């Protein structure tokens, strides 16, 4: 995966500041070379971990269904990069897994591809690209983890639990608003029935 320091700070500074405040830590203003703070890197690590987890949860704005992953034409190998949080198939039971560091077709027992596969992939994207609701949820979860890893404060743990529940509720609301998901004329089975 990625190291915490590699990415620059644009709006992750606010998330890091919130994580450090969930424990009393005063807010930094740099989140850069001029940090020299052991509680800032340990907050960015938590933020990255939680961002990866939330993205891997499989939300509708980062499923990017219909990829056309292409293999090297001289080696015929697709790479199952660590950024690929979840690789699946549009149809039912999926046949793509990770052997070594390359996609492996378990049913065909071969990792050599000629044309290119189509999958339902979740490619990791920076914390900035997350919507506001998802950013708030990630910040709250990272705050809870930071507090209970480094300080404790059971009352703060309870408050963060409530905030995490509220943030998850908001994120789910955003997801259902985003998708639409009409059970009639939107379903993959009922829509055909309504043909009349």
């Amino acid at each position: 995966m990625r190291s915490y320091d590699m990415n620059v700070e644009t709006a992750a500074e606010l998330s890091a500041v919130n994580d450090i405040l969930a424990s009393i830590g005063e807010p930094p203003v740099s989140t850069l070379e001029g940090d020299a703070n052991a509680d800032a890197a340990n907050a960015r690590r938590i933020l990255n971990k939680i961002n990866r987890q939330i993205q891997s949860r499989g939300w509708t704005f980062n499923i990017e269904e219909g990829i056309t992953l292409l293999p090297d034409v001289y080696s015929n190998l697709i790479v199952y990069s660590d950024d690929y949080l979840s690789l699946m198939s549009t149809s039912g039971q999926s046949i793509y897994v990770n052997r070594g560091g390359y996609v492996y077709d378990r049913t065909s027992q071969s990792d050599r591809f000629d044309s290119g596969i189509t999958v339902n992939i979740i490619r990791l994207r920076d914390y900035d690209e997350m919507p506001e609701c998802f950013r708030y949820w990630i910040v709250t979860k990272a705050s809870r983890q930071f507090n209970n890893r480094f300080f404790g404060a059971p009352e703060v743990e309870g408050v963060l639990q409530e905030e995490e529940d509220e943030a998850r509720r908001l994120c789910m609301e955003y997801e259902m608003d985003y998708g639409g998901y009409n059970m009639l004329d939107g379903d993959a089975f009922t829509s055909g029935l309504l043909t009349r």
């Binding site: 940090d35 020299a36 052991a38 890197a41």
Partner: protein
């Protein structure tokens, strides 16, 4: 084991010692002053046996090999048999030379990479510092100045730490019945504002090292053969205690 101290009488706070190596006899001084510098220009009061203030002469650096060789009998007036000779520069850089298989007499040359013709260095042997903590047991003091250790009760399980002041690097060994572990402290943290490139890595703080064991078959000792100063303020341990196994 190669040297034989013949006398170490001190005047007020300086211990003058004669050492009888298998080759020659040396006269050395040990100073007990709290905060001072033995030789002018020393960066951090280097802890180095047979410490000397040597200025490399011309004609030693050789371009063809990119090495600076200095003859030990030229530095001192004798030959040595064992020890890891250490070379220290005014800022604090160290080039440690391991003992040659045949001893320093056979190969008394100190070969340093670079051109150090006319600069200044401090030569000397390393000091093997060994301290072994007694078993970390529940010790309690009575009303008077008498301490009683709690032998009764379950053999506790622990996790310990240690403090230091203006110290450098010290290795910590913890040995169980079967295996052993090592924790070398080296210097300050990696991203800290105290680990700057080109500046001395001396600092004060606390080091916590795991000690998982039975608390009586688990031995902890500190080793430090480096020249950097080492001062220890105190230690401690955290563990779980129960009342069981009174007699096995």
């Amino acid at each position: 084991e190669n040297v034989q101290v013949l006398a170490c009488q001190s005047i007020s706070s300086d211990m003058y010692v004669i050492l009888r190596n298998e080759f020659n006899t040396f006269l050395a001084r040990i100073s007990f002053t709290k905060n001072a510098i033995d030789l002018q220009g020393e960066p951090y009061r280097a802890f180095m046996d047979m410490k000397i203030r040597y200025t490399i002469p011309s004609g030693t650096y050789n371009d063809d090999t990119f090495t600076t060789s200095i003859h030990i009998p030229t530095i001192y007036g004798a030959n040595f048999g064992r020890g890891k000779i250490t070379v220290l520069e005014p800022d604090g850089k160290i080039t440690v030379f391991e003992q040659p298989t045949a001893g320093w007499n056979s190969d008394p040359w100190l070969r340093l990479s670079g051109n150090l013709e006319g600069r200044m260095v401090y030569i000397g042997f390393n000091i093997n510092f060994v301290y072994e903590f007694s078993k970390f047991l529940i010790k309690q003091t009575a009303d008077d100045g008498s301490t009683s250790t709690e032998d009764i009760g379950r053999l506790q399980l622990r996790r310990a730490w240690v403090n230091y002041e203006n110290s450098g690097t010290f290795d910590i060994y913890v040995e169980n019945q079967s295996s052993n572990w090592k924790y070398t402290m080296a210097g300050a943290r990696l991203g800290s504002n105290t680990l700057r490139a080109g500046r001395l890595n001396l600092g004060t703080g606390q080091y916590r090292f795991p000690v998982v064991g039975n608390a009586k078959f688990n031995t902890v000792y500190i080793l430090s053969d480096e020249t950097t100063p080492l001062n220890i303020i105190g230690c401690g341990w955290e563990g779980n205690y129960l009342r069981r196994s009174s007699g096995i």
